[PDB]
Amino acid sequence: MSDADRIAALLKDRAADPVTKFSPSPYETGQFLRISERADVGTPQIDYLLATQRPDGLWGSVGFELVPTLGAVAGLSSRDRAGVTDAVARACEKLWELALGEGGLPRLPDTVASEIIVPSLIDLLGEVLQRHRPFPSPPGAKPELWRRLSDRIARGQAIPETAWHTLEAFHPLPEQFAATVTPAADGAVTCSPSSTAAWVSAGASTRAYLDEAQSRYGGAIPMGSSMPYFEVLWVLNLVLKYFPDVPIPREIIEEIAAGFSESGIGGGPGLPPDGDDTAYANLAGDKLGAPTHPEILMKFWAEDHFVSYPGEQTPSETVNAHALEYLNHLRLRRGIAEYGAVEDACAEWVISQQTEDGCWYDKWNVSPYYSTAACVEALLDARKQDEPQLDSLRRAREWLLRHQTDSGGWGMAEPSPEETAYAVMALDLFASRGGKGAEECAAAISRAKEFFKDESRENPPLWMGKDLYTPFRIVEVTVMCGRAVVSRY
């Protein structure tokens, strides 16, 4: 009974249930509890919020605590039961402990709409827990932007469909604005159960969607939904590198082909086209004999770099990695450097985003292991072999070798199978090129054998929505690719 057979089994089941599998979040559970009215269900969410709370009374991963901790307490302050106020009391006591310290509150992580989620919850939760005192004011927190959209909504003036993702920031939603909103063909308002909730509180497809979302895990609410293209393209683009001779469902091919359009493809329907998924639809298309067009990708190109979204506040480093990979593959296969200009420029740009320590980060996943391994696949096959590129790649690898742990794995903090599979993946590409360092890259991988075959550990949430989450299908495949690399050394 093979992993190969398993991926093939995963691929058949993916084509059966196109329902996206993102891990629950205390923020999304925290907002859903507050908003889905008449208490269709309340206690199931409460139980889940108390078990996942951290000993220090907070919620979330170390350095991404505010948005989830505010989300949960808002939920447990709305409308108590056993240990709820104890939770609410100890959570709030540990929040003023930080807002009253050195530098005050740590800057907002660049998690989706932190800029809005955080001001909104503190106004609402200010009046809730102004007590438990002897104000917060996060550095990246833009109340101005929050209050602006607030009164744009009340005037019945349309809002960017990007904020439709986080309507739960506008708690009492006026009806004349709710009538502007249409949910997707699956019942979701812009990929978020708690935003859909806000819409509803102010219907068949949408109830079925919320039925499933309050049932999958016993009450805990999936952090986001409706993103079958994202989780399809990332799975398929790892099956195509580490599992050739596993047969891909046609029905999955046609599914991508359905969502791909003039302006490209988004993470899912209800999202606009983005450079990441367009620059991965293309690549998988190529690898499978589909007629693919770089002309569409150039539409996500700006001056010096490809953009996740044409309106780019802060740019994304994996988008440029994912796009260059496609451009390298096309030049190597087609035999012409048609985008010679963009390749080099995108290569320059990728290099200038590396930190002094040797790794990259990304807008979309918060572990440098995702971003570094992606930037490294792109750079090894980058056409020029400029000293900037090989010195870049030389520092990247060095970083990779020096951060391995006694367990054999790697991690932005505690080691994990997702981040270990990223390092071992990035090492394999080095070992299989040769030269100085290449044999230390392989030894490093042989050492990962123990980490993987060892315990069934858990997957920390490293991906960035409005809070962090595991995209389970994508992480399911990543770890097995790491193992396939591992079980070649």
Numbering used by the authors: 1 to 79, 84 to 138, 150 to 217, 223 to 509
Lines quoted from the article behind this entry:
To contribute towards understanding the sequence-structure-function relationships of type II bacterial TSs, we determined the structure of the terpentedienyl diphosphate synthase Tpn2 from Kitasatospora sp. CB02891 by X-ray crystallography and made structure-guided mutants to probe its mechanism. TSs employ carbocation chemistry to convert acyclic prenyl diphosphates into diverse terpene skeletons. Canonical bacterial TSs are categorized into type I or type II depending on how they initiate catalysis.
We experimentally verified Tpn2 as a TPP synthase and determined its structure by X-ray crystallography at a resolution of 2.57 Å. This is only the third structurally determined bacterial type II TS and the first from any organism that produces a clerodane skeleton. As seen in PtmT2 and Rv3377c16,26, Tpn2 adopts the characteristic double α-barrel βγ fold with the active site residing in the interfacial cavity. As is typical for TSs from both eukaryotes and prokaryotes, the active site cavity of Tpn2 is lined with both aromatic (H180, F250, W254, Y329, W384, W483, and Y489) and aliphatic (V116, A117, T177, T181, G244, G287, L291, and G485) residues to form a hydrophobic pocket suitable for binding the long nonpolar tail of the substrate and preventing water or other nucleophiles from prematurely quenching the reaction. At the bottom of the active site pocket lies the catalytically essential Asp-rich motif D294xDD. Docking experiments support that the central Asp, D296, is properly positioned (3.2 Å from C14) for both the protonation of GGPP and the deprotonation of the syn-cleroda-13E-en-4-yl+ intermediate (TPP+). D296 is also suitably positioned (2.8 Å) near H342 for activation. As with PtmT2 and Rv3377c, no bound divalent metal ions can be inferred in the electron density of the crystal structure of Tpn2, leaving the exact binding mechanism of divalent ions in bacterial type II TSs undetermined. Lacking an analogous Asp on the side opposing the DxDD motif, Tpn2 instead has a G485 situated 3.6 Å from C19 of the substrate. Thus, G485D acts as a single-residue switch, exhibiting sole control over the formation of the clerodane TPP or labdane syn-CPP.
